[PDB]
Ligand binder design. Structure first.
Ligand SMILES: C[S@+](CC[C@H](N)C(=O)[O-])C[C@H]1O[C@@H](n2cnc3c(N)ncnc32)[C@H](O)[C@@H]1O
Ligand SMILES: C[S@+](CC[C@H](N)C(=O)[O-])C[C@H]1O[C@@H](n2cnc3c(N)ncnc32)[C@H](O)[C@@H]1O
Lengths: 336, 338
């Protein structure tokens, strides 16, 4: 309730937001797990059917210099692969993206489509590693597209096209040898309408690669458990879907699964720790950026606080049980 | 290997067999479960992929005398689990409950055409055909006497709506399509599920559905390879590389069919059914001996075959009961044409 403003204040230590989050982790686990497999399964199946009763996505801008501080060279807004705790944020971005390339079976000369390309992390990585490829990225953000185009000029890249559109409404009669959808489906609800649409963009014998945060076992809409659930109200003021690792297996009407992998929650957990450290290491430069963009020192402090809590809360949540609760799922599809 | 001989000569008590099986399941569980999800998933995906490079089924005198099945199995001769809504539910009731459950989850309606793959002695074929006089039910079997048994049930019950095709499902070809297809305890005999589901899916009519029930472990899948050199159960019961599916392995075989629904049922149900079989066998052991002595021509072969059946029932009752029935269990999957 009034709990947050005390922290916008700076009144509980990290250690105690960490402790609040563990309480919410456990209450979500208690809610989600069932005494028998018959129930566990019935609840996932029932949950998938209800997703087919929704819209594809809710019908609903971070300053670039702040992202240059928090994210890493590549402006990758999504997890890295950490071989160690000694892996740097920026090695982790590159590692995870080569992992994508290997699992999606990217080859030089393929046409490639990057749905929700953001600041072009993967779009620029693919385009530089395979100059024979023609890479098309889709974003609904003019700021992101002009930034990416600015990098293409800089690095001297001529194999990159950026279409400005809502993926939800994008229509084309061009098909692509490979399609990427990394951390997009977190923004979707009717997985069935989304995969149906994307499937018509897949070329003959093409592949769609999808990566999504998930719980290992159960799925759910972000809506408070208790009266005491601050974290959903605060982190997510516009409801969205935390998927489960296996839930896209139930959405194979227009695409078929070729391969399926998961990665431990330690990877996003580590990533979020690096985001928090870089934030706090440059905290003064961050306050200046936020004052300029948001117009006041108070509203700036509100956003710095939001981001620290986001990183703190989610680093803890994904570390749960050595990363074996919330985690990453990767799915390779072909058409039809 | 000399274990078996002393079993067959009636040394090793039922509790020793039960204890042996417990050891065997704990090795299987410890072989199968992995310390991380990424490994667990990788085991399963990799095992699924390897199935796609196999035969649909292995190629093959191991038929069961029919009077023995009348004793062991129960009124409809269902050779697959019953549903026990309790421990007071009888064998005969479990069969009818389970088969009504099939009729509801597969959405059967009067007048539909129905194909029953691997119909056995026709438990489901006859139950559906007696329940829905407007349906035409086609059963497929590779067994001459299973087909002749069913056509005689049709004579006795005065059903004109049942047709049995004598054929190997793996090789059968037809241009007919059906509103409803059943495959109950059939994929336990299959290896390449992909090739199997491809063939079958051509038999599904427009808006038709396919209902598959299979035994499985909850999490991981494997072939019956012996685990170590202490493993007697595997090549005693399965000497033919059959496959133990996992509850979700068919989610990875959706190239020609799409999942409409997916359920599991506790291993308690198959556990109690095997117990029921064992009781009826023991309660009629003299008649069983006679039936086997007659049909296999030996006192020796007869004891070997009674032993095998009792071991099979004791061991599988134990395995399916493991951890309150939450390890090995039943999976039911409903598919539409893709
Ligand atoms: C957390 S992700 C990051 C994207 C990119 N895969 C990456 O790793 O940086 C969110 C992205 O999805 C994009 N997005 C969400 N909904 C979209 C839509 N309907 N059309 C286009 N882009 C969308 C947003 O613009 C944002 O860049
Ligand atoms: C465990 S089931 C029992 C049958 C029946 N579906 C039931 O639930 O009572 C096994 C049946 O599959 C049949 N079967 C196995 N492989 C077959 C094949 N390739 N072609 C035809 N029938 C087959 C066998 O004849 C056997 O009766």
């Amino acid at each position: 309730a009034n709990l947050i403003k005390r922290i916008e204040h700076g009144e509980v230590s990290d250690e105690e937001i960490r402790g609040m989050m563990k309480i919410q982790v456990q209450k979500r686990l208690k809610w989600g797990y069932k005494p028998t497999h018959e129930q566990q399964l019935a609840q996932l199946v029932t949950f998938a059917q209800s997703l087919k009763g929704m819209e594809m996505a809710e019908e609903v801008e971070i300053p670039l210099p702040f992202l240059h501080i928090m994210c890493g060279k590549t402006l990758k807004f999504s997890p890295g692969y950490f071989k160690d705790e000694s892996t740097t944020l920026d090695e982790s971005e590159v590692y995870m993206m080569d992992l994508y390339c290997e699992r999606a079976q990217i080859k030089d000369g393929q046409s490639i489509l990057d749905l929700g390309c953001g600041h072009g992390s993967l779009t620029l990585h693919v385009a530089q590693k395979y100059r024979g490829c023609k890479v098309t990225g889709i974003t609904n953000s003019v700021s992101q597209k002009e930034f990416i185009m600015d990098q293409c000029k800089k690095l001297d890249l001529s194999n990159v096209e950026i279409i400005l559109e809502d993926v939800t409404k994008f229509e084309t009669e061009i098909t692509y040898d490979r399609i990427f959808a990394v951390a997009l489906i977190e923004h979707m609800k009717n997985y069935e309408l989304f995969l149906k649409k994307v499937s018509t963009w897949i070329a003959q014998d093409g592949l769609l690669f999808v990566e999504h945060h998930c719980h290992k076992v159960f799925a759910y809409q972000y809506e408070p458990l208790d009266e005491d659930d601050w974290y959903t109200e605060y982190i997510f003021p516009g409801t969205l879907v935390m998927s489960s690792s296996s839930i896209l297996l139930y959405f194979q009407e227009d695409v078929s699964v070729v391969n399926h992998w998961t990665l431990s929650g330690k990877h996003p957990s580590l990533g979020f720790k690096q985001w928090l450290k870089r934030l706090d290491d440059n905290i003064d430069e961050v306050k200046e950026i936020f004052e300029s963009f948001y117009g006041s020192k108070e509203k700036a402090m509100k956003f710095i606080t939001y981001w620290r809590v986001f990183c703190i809360a989610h680093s803890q949540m994904y570390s749960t049980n050595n990363g074996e609760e919330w985690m990453l799922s990767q799915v390779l599809f072909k058409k039809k």
